[PDB]
Amino acid sequence: EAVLTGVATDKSEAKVTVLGISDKPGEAAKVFRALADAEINIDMVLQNVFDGTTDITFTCPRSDGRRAMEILKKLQVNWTNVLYDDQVGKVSLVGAGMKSHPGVTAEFMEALRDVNVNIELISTSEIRISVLIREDDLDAAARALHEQFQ
């Protein structure tokens, strides 16, 4: 039903969060058009459900970060804030068929609890469990997953 092949780490991205985007057709688009037209190639994109407003966060190369802010900053007049992080780190467990084995996702979490590392962001699928954490927590984070899962 499932299989778990390896872990990945990454400290090349920055995280930018646009707070208070009004939950309405077309508003997500406004944030990504700008970025796209300035040729910032984006990776992770995340939004949860919700003033009835919600927030979007995306990651991009750190090299492009400040510049991604500028394009969002100078065109902020329909969002309340835009944050920059640039000290973020991504750890992913890779595999396939994890939906029928929910223990995997539980164990992923519990693995980081036991090395005392706080999960800032989560986005999973049947083939990948990814979390953003403090970049300095990576080596621990990664190590702990190997012991948990082997």
Partner 1 sequence: ALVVQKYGGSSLESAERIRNVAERIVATKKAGNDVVVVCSAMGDTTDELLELAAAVNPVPPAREMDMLLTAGERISNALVAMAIESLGAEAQSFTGSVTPGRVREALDEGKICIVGGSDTTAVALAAALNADVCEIYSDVDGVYTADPRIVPNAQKLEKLSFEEMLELAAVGSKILVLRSVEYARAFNVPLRVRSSYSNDPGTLIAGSMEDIPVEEAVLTGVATDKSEAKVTVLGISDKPGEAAKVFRALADAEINIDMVLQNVFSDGTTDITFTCPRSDGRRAMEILKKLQVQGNWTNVLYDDQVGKVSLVGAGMKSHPGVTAEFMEALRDVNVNIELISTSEIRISVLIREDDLDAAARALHEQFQLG
Ligand X SMILES: N[C@@H](CCCC[NH3+])C(=O)O
Ligand Y SMILES: C[C@@H](O)[C@H](N)C(=O)O
Query: Could you give the CA distance from residue 9 to residue 74 in angstroms, rounded to a whole number?
Result: 33
- Smaller CB distance to partner 1: residue 5 or 77? 5
Which of 22-30, 41-49, 76-84, 100-108 is the region at the interface with ligand X (rule: CB under 6 A)? Answer: 41-49
Residues 47 and 49: their CA atoms lie apart, in Å, by: 7
Radius of gyration for the alpha carbons in the chain, expressed in angstroms and rounded: 17
Q: Are strands 53-61 and 81-84 parallel, antiparallel or unpaired?
A: unpaired
Q: Report the sign of the C-alpha dihedral through residues 8, 86, 133, 138, in that order.
A: positive
Q: How many residues bind partner 1 (CB under 8 A)?
A: 61
CA distance 14 to 86: 4
39 belongs to the binding site for ligand X (CB under 6 A): no
47 is in an annotated binding site: yes
Span interacting with ligand X, options 35-43, 84-92, 130-138, 140-148, rule CB under 6 A:
35-43
Q: Quick one: which segment of 13-21, 36-44, 109-117, 141-149 binds ligand X (CB under 6 A)?
A: 36-44
Single residue of 23, 43, 86, 136 touching ligand X by CB under 6 A: 43
* Residues near ligand X, by CB under 6 A: 41-43, 45
